[PDB]
Write a protein that binds this DNA or RNA. Structure first.
Lengths: 57, 69, 91, 120, 149
RNA sequence: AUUCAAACGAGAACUUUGAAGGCCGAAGUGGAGAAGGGUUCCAUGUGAACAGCAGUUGAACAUGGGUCAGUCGGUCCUGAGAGAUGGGCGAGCGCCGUUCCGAAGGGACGGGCGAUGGCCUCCGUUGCCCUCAGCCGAUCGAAAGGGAGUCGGGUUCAGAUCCCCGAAUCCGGAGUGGCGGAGAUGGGCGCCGCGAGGCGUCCAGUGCGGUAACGCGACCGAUCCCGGAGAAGCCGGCGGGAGCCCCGGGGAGAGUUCUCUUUUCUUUGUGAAGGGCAGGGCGCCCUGGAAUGGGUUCGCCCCGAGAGAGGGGCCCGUGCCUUGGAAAGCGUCGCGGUUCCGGCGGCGUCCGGUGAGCUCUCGCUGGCCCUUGAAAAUCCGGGGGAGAGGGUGUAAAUCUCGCGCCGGGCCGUACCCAUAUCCGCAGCAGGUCUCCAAGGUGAACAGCCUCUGGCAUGUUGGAACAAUGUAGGUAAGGGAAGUCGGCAAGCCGGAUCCGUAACUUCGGGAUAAGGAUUGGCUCUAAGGGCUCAGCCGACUUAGAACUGGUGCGGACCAGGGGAAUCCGACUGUUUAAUUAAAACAAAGCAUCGCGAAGGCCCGCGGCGGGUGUUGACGCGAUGUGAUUUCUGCCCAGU
RNA sequence: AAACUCUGGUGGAGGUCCGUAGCGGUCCUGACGUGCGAAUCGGUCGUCCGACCUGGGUAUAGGGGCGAAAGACUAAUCGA
């Protein structure tokens, strides 16, 4: 199996260094540095545990 | 990239001033009409065979055509 | 089946900390993990979040309470005492 | 050569007592064995309630006996249902022929007073 | 962290500017979210109402008491503690209160306190069982724990 | 752990190529980084010195070469903290202190006046006056935290998310705004035209749909106000999606073919950013009203504060399809350029199945805390409604909609990253932070063997096989007689089925002790999905027969046991380099001080500082040391 | 009768046990002892979800610091 490496100079598994695999059209797997996942706004009522609808996270 | 589906807006984009070039990719089962504009590369894929050369001549003569293969 | 004879929740401590200390922590540790009935919504959901803080998982209402119990006996006598001096001052 | 051996393990060869190093729970965790069994049986009951073979009231009581580790597999449960469907169908026949005997004499009595209000 | 008694964010409506001032009281046991807290000289006498001591009757159980008028509370504010208004003195505007240590003190009548005991009482009853639990307790307060004699 | 042959050469155990035999064996002797080094990188040349033998080789020496960015980092933000000014102190260099003893804002909106520039239109610029303001502590502090936005293919002797090609994207800017679209174009009336329509007046227009959740491409608005995101611990369980592995086929090319094998091996793809759909999630809505309670999980959990059952909505979609995109990549077959060649062609890049599998990730749900698990920059929404705009039109103000145009500076970027590029005086068995992780056996990231990749046995060879060593072994009969002492070695060892004492804080002790079994082969039984029957699918357990020179956890991996005493309850810690303990800590117990002008303590000094963002359930100072059971007499001395 | 008690599952607590990486450093009083090494090596060992291990940033400076306390550590230097 092909083992692969990082592509930046950050060699630690920090929260800003998260990756996902990707098969390129050149028949090779590479890393693709993901974006941190967003969160939809929490209600201003401060009591509903869920999050708002109709707005992008 | 942006896929143009219906036929008449393609020539509407083809006559834009920023439309630099058009290319004709004639593969099997399709004939795609790639037109390079400033921000995107609009594509018009038509499954018909003869309707392609129904339009291949309909391009504005100023814009450079390119038979791609 | 009944797994233990007389060692309840504190069975997790094994053979440590001595018998009396493992016995007087049992009455407390049962209490601080029990779910109480929320006096606002009625559902049995009052559960201790942190020490002194009790949250109801249903009406989402937080209550300042005792450290290991929902109500301290010293508090309930004070609430009833204040309630008597209150109506006694204003008459 | 590996393929030739795994084909023999499928037939149960090389898996005797003298070729097992991990405990039975390590080779086959009893939690996932219990998981497979629950998901299977709960799914079976969920089809029977869906196909009207059993009702809500039998489903609920039978659901908990599954959770109580009463039925060992799908066949043992499926046959236990047959005995429950049978006996209640007897009770359903026994409590309707007896109700027919009861409601018949009800109006057969009312027919009798019907001769009293007409002659008086 | 580092304090047994829980706190309570109480939001007021600033009387001079369009704004909402927020505070951190020391929660009196029985306080719940969405409860109205009243503060001042005309405030009624219920749990979680800070009002001047001179207005309270004798034997009133208070907490977060001010030791000097207007210092925002200094006395009886650990978990489960309280002070009692022992007696008043209309002239000279002074009041005797006993403290959780048993000491009785003569304070001014103007300084105020929230009614009721401090939440989180009975904390010292559960035995620290492990040396580890003690480590985590003091790791949140200050470097003082392992005490070589 | 090397061997054979060849080439180059004055010269070969050591260089290079080929072959063979081996090792590392994915927790690597592999592929990449941080710190550190600083040219060691790369090419050519040399063989003086150096590389503890040699050298035709080198990290040596001599010549030259080499590091390319709006998107990767720095830069920005704040963290623990550091540190100016005011102030205070100080003989003094200076020090304290960081919101405290301070006139700490050089900004903004609108209005008014004057003035200018461009078609002084209208707008911009400026001065003055008026009006408003919470700011709140200058500044520094992270190449792992926060932080918009770049990916695919190709290319070098050495550089590539940087160059080339092709696809994108973020931010910033735009009197005359560059163009569309939205704002937006309707109604009443009086006439004409048979009508179809068109006139002259009056009035409206800061969008629209859905019962709702909410939707639609935009859809005015300032100071102020509220909120959100940034922005959160550890652990367990389960689910989804990938990557890998595996299985059954189909091609292409290779290996084997003494015999057998429709065989064995390799290979068999699609980026970012859009669009659509699965698939996940929802404490989202509507109908309705549930006990004979039901729904439901591995566990739970949910319900008249609205269950089931229907019908919707939203969020994430990294998966699939599609634009990109087959043109490119790869695999083969062939033709060229005699060559210089991102040369040019031919087909191919296929169809399925599985899984407590592994890793990554997303999500749901619990557990634990006298532990509650960052800030700020930055960005967004809402509430308000001061204002602004045009009068039915070539409409105006205005637009977070579509497209077009311009710009993105500065610094780092080579290589090593470790049994030879770092630190240990050195090519030193030491030390030094991370990422990726194949097949078989197996519980397993164990050990053992192998593939991808890598290497030459660790600063030398040759010939012998003495004594003493060092490291491995084996020993008749006896079995600790040896010795300070069972030190050292040995025995035991996995799993399955049985069986398990004293004592006990009732939890343990416990894998107690003690037994039996274990291979190969051929079977039988049981355990599921999809449409009674048929069709698919996996592993696992139990039992039986036969069989071998009784051998079978056959290597590897892998607990000697018992009964008593002393000490310390336990886990933990400790004399780096002679002491790991019975010492220290510890929970528990008990004293002592203190209500803030305070206790304890620091400080040369100050309205100084720590505890203290504290307040007796607290802080400070001591002894003892879990539990159990107790803790006697002495206040003369000190 | 009740109080509840038994039996089988489920569940997955713990400064829980065996044990790898890691972090340690018990014994051989082994090797070495002008060493590979001004403290290393082999076998055997301790612990391995917690008072755990660790990088970087930051604070404490010499009669001072810091010390789960050995007069330990404070750049091979520590009763100054």
């Amino acid at each position: 199996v092909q083992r692969l490496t990082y592509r930046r100079r950050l060699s630690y598994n920090t929260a800003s260094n998260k990756t996902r695999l990707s098969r390129t059209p050149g028949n090779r797997i590479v890393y693709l540095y993901t974006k941190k996942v967003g969160k939809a706004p929490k209600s201003a009522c401060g009591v509903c545990p869920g999050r708002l609808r109709g707005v992008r996270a | 990239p942006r896929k143009i589906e219906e036929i008449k807006d393609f020539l509407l984009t083809a006559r834009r001033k920023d439309a630099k070039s058009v290319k004709i990719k004639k593969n099997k089962d399709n004939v795609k009409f790639k037109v390079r504009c400033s921000r995107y590369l609009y594509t018009l894929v038509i499954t018909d065979k003869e309707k392609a050369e129904k339009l291949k001549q309909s391009l504005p003569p100023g814009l450079a055509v390119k038979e791609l293969k | 089946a009944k797994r233990t004879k007389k060692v309840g929740i504190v069975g997790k401590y094994g053979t440590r900390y001595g018998a009396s200390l493992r016995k007087m922590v049992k009455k407390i540790e049962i209490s601080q993990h029990a779910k109480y009935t929320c006096s606002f919504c009625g559902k049995t959901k009052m559960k201790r979040r942190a020490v002194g803080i009790w949250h109801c998982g249903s009406c989402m209402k937080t209550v300042a309470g005792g450290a290991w119990t929902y109500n301290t006996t010293s508090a309930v006598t004070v609430k009833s005492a204040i309630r008597r001096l209150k109506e006694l001052k204003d008459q | 050569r590996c393929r030739k051996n795994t084909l023999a393990r499928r037939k149960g060869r090389h898996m005797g007592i003298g070729k097992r190093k991990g405990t039975a729970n390590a080779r086959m965790p009893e939690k996932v064995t219990w998981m497979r069994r629950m998901r299977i049986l709960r799914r079976l009951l969920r089809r029977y309630r869906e196909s009207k073979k059993i009702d809500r009231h039998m489903y609920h009581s039978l659901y908990l006996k599954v959770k109580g580790n009463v039925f060992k597999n799908k066949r043992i449960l499926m046959e236990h249902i047959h005995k429950l469907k049978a006996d209640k169908a007897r009770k359903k026949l026994l409590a309707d022929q007896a109700e027919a005997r009861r409601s018949k004499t009800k109006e057969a009595r009312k027919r009798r007073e019907e001769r009293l209000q007409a002659k008086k | 962290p580092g304090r047994g008694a829980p706190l309570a964010k109480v939001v007021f409506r600033d009387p001079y500017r369009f704004k909402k001032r927020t505070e951190l009281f020391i929660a009196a046991e029985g306080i719940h979210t969405g409860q109205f807290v009243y503060c001042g000289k005309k405030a009624q006498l219920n749990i979680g109402n800070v009002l001047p001591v001179g207005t309270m009757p004798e034997g009133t159980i208070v907490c977060c008491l001010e030791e000097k008028p207007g210092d925002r509370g200094k006395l009886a504010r650990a978990s489960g503690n309280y002070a009692t208004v022992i007696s008043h003195n209309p002239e000279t505007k002074k009041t005797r209160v006993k403290l959780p240590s048993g000491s009785k003190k003569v304070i001014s009548s103007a300084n105020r306190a929230v009614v009721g005991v401090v939440a989180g009482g009975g904390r010292i009853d559960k035995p620290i069982l492990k040396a580890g639990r003690a480590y985590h307790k003091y790791k949140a307060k200050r470097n003082c724990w392992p005490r070589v004699r």
